[PDB]
């Protein structure tokens, strides 16, 4: 209704594409993101989301360069740093992925999922600096996401490689 009423509404395209991504069907979602970008050049959020999809069906690091576009349009957008670092760690280029995670976290002091992913990457390269406190803070944030009770920051596979309660990991798997 909003679109037929206002055939140049950008945020409406964005939300519609978001739910279509939630609907799993993507071609129309990708198209909606595309048209939203056309009608609004500086909509870095739509870059972030369209890259999210564009790697979600299967990786095209065109999603990565899209993340970079969103980055350079406004570097304050930490989520794009997080996503591109995630793509890097998917590729296996762990160091600069760690660098980008570390950046994004220092841009916004408290960002749970990015921080736990960074912790996983660090433990991959075995950087045991701040070890115990890293463990305790990640336990804290996963506990926090567990009684607020939606999606856990730590991935289930990473979970048991941490000292978390069997109840905690059971809850994460359930979630």
């Amino acid at each position: 209704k909003a679109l037929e009423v206002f055939p140049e509404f950008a945020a409406a395209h964005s939300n519609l594409a978001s739910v279509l991504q939630q609907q799993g069907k993507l071609q129309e979602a990708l198209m909606h993101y595309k048209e939203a970008i056309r009608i609004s050049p500086t909509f870095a959020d739509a870059y972030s989301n369209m890259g999210n999809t564009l790697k979600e069906m299967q990786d095209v690091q065109g999603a990565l360069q899209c993340y970079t576009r969103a980055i350079q349009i406004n570097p304050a957008f930490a989520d794009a740093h997080s996503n591109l670092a995630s793509i890097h760690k998917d590729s296996g280029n762990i160091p600069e992925a760690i660098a980008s995670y570390r950046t994004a976290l220092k841009l916004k002091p408290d960002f749970p999922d990015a921080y736990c992913n960074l912790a996983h990457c660090l433990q991959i390269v075995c950087d045991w600096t701040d070890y115990d406190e890293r463990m305790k803070k990640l336990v804290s944030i996963v506990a926090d996401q567990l009684e607020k009770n939606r999606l856990p920051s730590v991935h289930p596979h990473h979970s048991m490689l941490y000292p978390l309660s069997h109840g905690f990991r059971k809850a994460i798997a359930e979630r």
Binding site: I124, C126, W128, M160
Partner: protein
């Protein structure tokens, strides 16, 4: 619940042999070794053969028969022996001696990439040498092959204790990932080990990734998350491993293969006696003989690698699920079938 798969696609590892080492007569098996499906066929081509039975605790019984896979064929050195030694020194890929194709392991990929990964069997006689991965030919080499992330400060302190308490030893690491090796190095000297006490090797295709395990003496294991596939790889080569089961399933995993190995002594209940077992192995210098000989002997007889019994038992378990559920019986703890 963990199936042995290496009994099929890597049958060439079933046998073992060494040429006469440069050490005067003494048997330090895992420095330069011989393997291959046709290695037995090479026994005739040996101008001088040497056979000594692998004297596991039988007492003259059960072992005086042939037991070709359960002895040592060692060839007293020849001029051709030095030729293949300096082969591995200088590194020509492979040649043929008396119709038997001798190939250095480190480059077997160039024989057949399809056989390199393990899809095809390395197809000729394969010789490997400790020095080709820079290893002290006359030391004690503990090993570990898993990904580097399943190691923590506490476990590093464990193996540093074991290493200090056994000075004449080196620990086998893998630059896997490559970048984390200096990162763990700094931790290694920061608590006081020089840059010689640990030797870290590059990633390889599986067939070499598991063949190189033979050259090590004893495998050190990660209690934080044991090596599921990697540990079993180490088993199939015949090199033993010692672990402390934790509480997570993975922490329990390493002990499962060892229980199927039928020898609890490699399973640890606490950190300190885990230290004790590792050092007892590395210091006895006789107990390695028993453990490795028996693992090599009954690894094939171990109920793990032979997929027959596992296949029938899993099929019977499928019978149990259907004969439980299909009668309307609700799902339950399905125990002692």
């Amino acid at each position: 619940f963990f199936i042995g798969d290496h009994a099929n696609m890597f049958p060439h590892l079933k046998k073992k042999a060494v040429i006469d080492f440069k050490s005067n007569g003494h048997i330090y098996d895992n420095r330069i070794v011989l393997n291959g499906i046709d290695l037995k066929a090479f026994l005739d081509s040996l101008p001088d053969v040497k056979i000594v039975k692998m004297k596991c605790p039988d007492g003259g019984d059960n072992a005086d028969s042939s037991n070709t896979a359960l002895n040592m064929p060692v060839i007293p050195m020849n001029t051709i022996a030095e030729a293949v030694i300096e082969m591995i020194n200088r590194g020509q890929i492979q040649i043929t001696i008396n119709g038997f194709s001798i190939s250095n392991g480190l480059a077997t990929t160039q024989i057949n990439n399809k056989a390199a990964t393990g899809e095809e069997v390395p197809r000729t006689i394969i010789v490997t040498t400790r020095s080709q991965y820079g290893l002290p030919e006359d030391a004690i080499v503990y090993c570990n092959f898993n990904q580097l992330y399943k190691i923590d400060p506490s476990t590093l302190q464990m193996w540093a204790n074991i290493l200090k308490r056994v000075p004449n030893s080196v620990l086998w690491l893998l630059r896997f990932p490559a970048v984390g090796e200096p990162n763990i190095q700094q931790y290694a000297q920061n608590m006081g080990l020089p840059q010689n006490r640990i030797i870290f090797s590059p990633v390889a295709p599986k067939e070499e990734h598991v063949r190189r395990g033979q050259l090590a003496d004893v495998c050190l294991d990660t209690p934080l998350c044991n090596g599921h596939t990697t540990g079993m790889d180490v088993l199939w080569a015949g090199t033993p491993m010692v672990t402390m089961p934790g509480e997570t399933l993975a922490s329990r995993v390493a002990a499962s293969q060892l229980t199927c190995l039928g020898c609890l002594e490699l399973i640890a209940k606490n950190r300190q006696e885990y230290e004790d077992i590792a050092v007892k192995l590395g210091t006895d210098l006789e107990y390695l003989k028993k453990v490795r000989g028996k693992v090599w002997k009954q690894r094939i007889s171990s109920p793990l690698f032979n997929t027959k019994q596992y296949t029938m038992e899993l099929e019977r378990l499928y019978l149990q699920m259907w004969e439980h559920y299909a009668a309307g019986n609700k799902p339950d703890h399905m125990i002692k079938p």
